[PDB]
Design a protein around this ligand. Structure first.
Ligand SMILES: Cc1ccc(-c2ccc(CN3CCN(C)CC3)cc2)cc1Nc1nc(-c2nccc(N)n2)cs1
Ligand SMILES: Cc1ccc(-c2ccc(CN3CCN(C)CC3)cc2)cc1Nc1nc(-c2nccc(N)n2)cs1
Ligand SMILES: O=c1ccn([C@@H]2O[C@H](COP(=O)(O)OP(=O)(O)O)[C@@H](O)[C@H]2O)c(=O)[nH]1
Ligand SMILES: O=c1ccn([C@@H]2O[C@H](COP(=O)(O)OP(=O)(O)O)[C@@H](O)[C@H]2O)c(=O)[nH]1
Ligand code: NA
Ligand code: NA
Lengths: 229, 229
């Protein structure tokens, strides 16, 4: 019938990829769209993405605009493919997105503008493109699940995951991203150009405690949340 | 009824803007979509476009990717607005485009890649974006009018138009762009990712002679061409 679209949102190493790979296995009616950036961080898209990530490590102020435009295009096409491809025989189909086009713009691209990694022209061009790319519709969200973790938890989990290039990420960076998620999804103080988001249902889950082998309470909250949508 | 879409193609200062402003006045069934880049060269789009042009003059190898993506997005939205906005009461509606999404990629973006103003990653990301942006359709061309002028004519006409920043453009640059137009529209030796273009009708018009006050023979050829479409 009609596919429910749920975004999983959270800071770096909150546990989004772990949570989404738990969920995908619990129902034939449940599908997942991993974040393209995450997959490049692990083919023409993956070759482009790998080069852009490596170029970003050296010179974020040169590559942030190129990176953010390609990350968001890659997400839109991957979300559309799943929407048009999967769950067509499902009774209660749910598609779980690892992050959204809204996190791309209002968390990451925003944060890069604020660190002077994009100049005003790059940021205004990006926002104009984003406003338009997201009208040329079927991707609007039924709900958001916020995986809430402390900067410290996320810093610990970056260490656990053990990607070389990420070991350099400092707590202060994580605390800024954390602040942006809290403004957007808890306090709802963040203004956007997408009216409907103001009223989209949000489930906040505390994931500071390890859930890898003990997630039943979280999934019960997800099932309850889904029945309200 | 159904709007005919005709692209006017030609080298820098061939006379496209002059020709299109002649045509627009000859029929209520005839509308025109100027090239956004041309308009920036004369408002949020114009402010962004003016900054990008100025940044390009200094450092083309820094701004070519950003410039080409914004030029082509600006063209797509301006072509779609005219298609959805105008000629709705017309008997034989024709929309004349100053250049196309195909010139953007196969003439300009291509030429910038070939002058090492974009690296391979920028060029592959641009082509991937272009292939996709042009599927998320109603912009496909019924015909192309090629305004054919010598590099020398175009060099003379740059001098006539008298834009400060353009007086630096050298004949060798114009001769490369000229070669690309000849490959694409006369010899049809240029391969693209758009099958239908191989078989699109092309009218070639020699505009080496001044036509500003003597264009009736050209318009007669345009009217004959249109009756075949
Ligand atoms: C790969 C990489 C490389 C480098 C840096 C980086 C390094 C340093 C800084 C500090 N500032 C100091 C001040 N200076 C003037 C400018 C740089 C800032 C960012 C970040 C990354 N990763 C990133 N990933 C995303 C992202 N992830 C998922 C979805 C999405 N949409 N976006 C955005 S950024
Ligand atoms: C505004 C500007 C500023 C500068 C240069 C420029 C300067 C010098 C060079 C020489 N090479 C030497 C080798 N070096 C490694 C790299 C530069 C190349 C280009 C061109 C422009 N104008 C342009 N307009 C378009 C365009 N126009 C309409 C539609 C569309 N889609 N695209 C494309 S480019
Ligand atoms: O409850 C958890 C959640 C995550 N992790 C680990 O923390 C790291 C970050 O998780 P993930 O990659 O899912 O984070 P994302 O960036 O996807 O939010 C990984 O090594 C996980 O295996 C963990 O040990 N327990
Ligand atoms: O038959 C012509 C065509 C053009 N021009 C002049 O040549 C310059 C370039 O024309 P246009 O701006 O139309 O060129 P485009 O870049 O639009 O092809 C302008 O000063 C025109 O007024 C001219 O004198 N006679
Ligand atoms: Na599943
Ligand atoms: Na007209």
């Amino acid at each position: 019938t009609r596919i429910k679209k749920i975004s999983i949102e959270g800071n770096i190493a909150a546990g989004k990829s772990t949570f989404v790979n738990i969920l995908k296995q619990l129902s034939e009616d449940w599908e997942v769209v991993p974040e393209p950036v995450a997959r490049w961080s692990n083919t023409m898209e993956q070759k482009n993405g790998g080069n852009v990530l490596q170029m970003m490590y050296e010179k974020p102020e040169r590559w942030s605009f190129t990176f953010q435009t390609y990350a968001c295009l890659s997400r839109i096409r991957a979300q559309l493919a799943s929407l048009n491809g999967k769950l067509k025989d499902a009774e209660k189909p749910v598609l779980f997105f690892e992050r959204s086009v809204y996190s791309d713009r209002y968390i990451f691209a925003s944060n890069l503008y604020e660190s002077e990694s994009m100049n005003e022209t790059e940021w205004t061009i990006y926002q104009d493109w984003h406003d338009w790319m997201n009208n040329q519709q079927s991707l609007e969200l039924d709900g958001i699940i916020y995986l809430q973790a402390t900067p410290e938890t996320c810093l610990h989990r970056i260490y656990l995951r053990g990607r070389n290039e990420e070991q350099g990420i400092p707590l202060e960076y994580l605390e800024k991203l954390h602040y942006k998620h809290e403004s957007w999804l808890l306090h709802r103080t963040l203004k956007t150009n997408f009216d409907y988001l103001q009223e989209v249902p949000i489930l906040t889950l505390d994931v500071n405690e390890d859930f890898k082998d003990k997630y039943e309470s979280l999934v019960e909250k997800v099932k309850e949340f889904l029945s309200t949508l």
